Nucleic acid binder design. Structure first.
Ligand code: MMC
Ligand code: MMC
Ligand code: MMC
Ligand code: MMC
Ligand code: MMC
Ligand SMILES: [Mg+2]
Ligand SMILES: [Mg+2]
Ligand SMILES: [Mg+2]
Ligand SMILES: [Mg+2]
Ligand SMILES: [Mg+2]
Ligand SMILES: [Mg+2]
Ligand SMILES: [Mg+2]
Ligand SMILES: [Mg+2]
Ligand SMILES: [Mg+2]
Ligand SMILES: [Mg+2]
Length: 133
RNA sequence: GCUGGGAUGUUGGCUUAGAAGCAGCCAUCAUUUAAAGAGUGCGUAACAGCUCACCAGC
């Protein structure tokens, strides 16, 4: 069982994909087209998928919501997180934005309340030099 | 002491060919918890895997 974060509508490259699971038994081509199939509904974003390979080299994979750090980057309109979180703020997002992301990632979050969800997201923002306003 | 658990965002941000708790720098929050560090050491190219913290039962 392998896991990785592949961009929406794109796959097959050797450096990014290939070698990775391609060395566990997986047949790249089938995944590239397959992944890029459903990753059509949500394109442009980087989404993490969990590939599972059965003894017979066959496989399946679940597509999850994009990473918090990623959504956060997007929200703050930045490209990278601070090189020194807290010491240097490189961006910021509104409390409502935290709410949006928390809502977006909810299926993958284990919070029992939207409040707890936002607290989770804020923890990530605090780790990448992104402030909340 | 023994057994079982040791979870979720998440491979935290940066860096890097990679850097996924564990080269290095910064941060070290939040969730679900009985409990579980943004992780004690081993380990991998990076993962994996083993181990410790911590909790539970005996
Ligand atoms: Hg690929
Ligand atoms: Hg492809
Ligand atoms: Hg990775
Ligand atoms: Hg730490
Ligand atoms: Hg692997
Ligand atoms: Mg509201
Ligand atoms: Mg004891
Ligand atoms: Mg044990
Ligand atoms: Mg990382
Ligand atoms: Mg690290
Ligand atoms: Mg590392
Ligand atoms: Mg390491
Ligand atoms: Mg706690
Ligand atoms: Mg329980
Ligand atoms: Mg005990």
């Amino acid at each position: 069982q392998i896991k990785l974060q592949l961009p929406a509508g794109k796959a097959t490259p050797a450096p990014p994909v290939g070698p990775a699971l391609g060395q566990h038994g997986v047949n790249i081509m089938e995944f590239c087209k397959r992944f890029n199939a459903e990753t059509a509904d949500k394109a442009g974003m980087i989404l993490p998928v969990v590939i599972t390979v059965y003894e017979d080299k066959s496989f399946t994979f679940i597509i999850k919501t994009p990473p918090a750090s990623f959504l956060l980057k997007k929200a703050a309109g930045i490209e990278k997180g601070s090189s020194e979180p807290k010491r240097k703020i490189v961006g910021k997002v509104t409390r409502k934005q935290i709410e949006e992301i928390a809502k977006t990632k909810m299926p993958d979050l284990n919070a029992n309340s939207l409040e707890a969800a936002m607290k989770i997201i804020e923890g990530t923002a605090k780790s990448m030099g992104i402030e909340v306003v």
